[PDB]
Amino acid sequence: WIFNTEIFPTVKEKAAILTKMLAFEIRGEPSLSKLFYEIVLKLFDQEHFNNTEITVRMEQPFLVGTRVE
Secondary structure, three states, X not given: OOXXXXXXXXXXXHHHHHHHOHHHOOOOXXXXXXXXXXXXXXXXXXXXXXXXXXXXXXXXXXXXXXXXX
């Protein structure tokens, strides 16, 4: 949905729960970042154009997502 289209309701709140997704890593839910990665991978993939999926929220968990198992 956040990579769907341009109707655009719920933009920062989609970024907001994305911050909440990382703390499942200390729970051992491996896909939680891995889907968050593969979405952010697909955020990085196929676009390479815009700072959508707001690049503030796109930059910083990309860091800790590199420092993972």
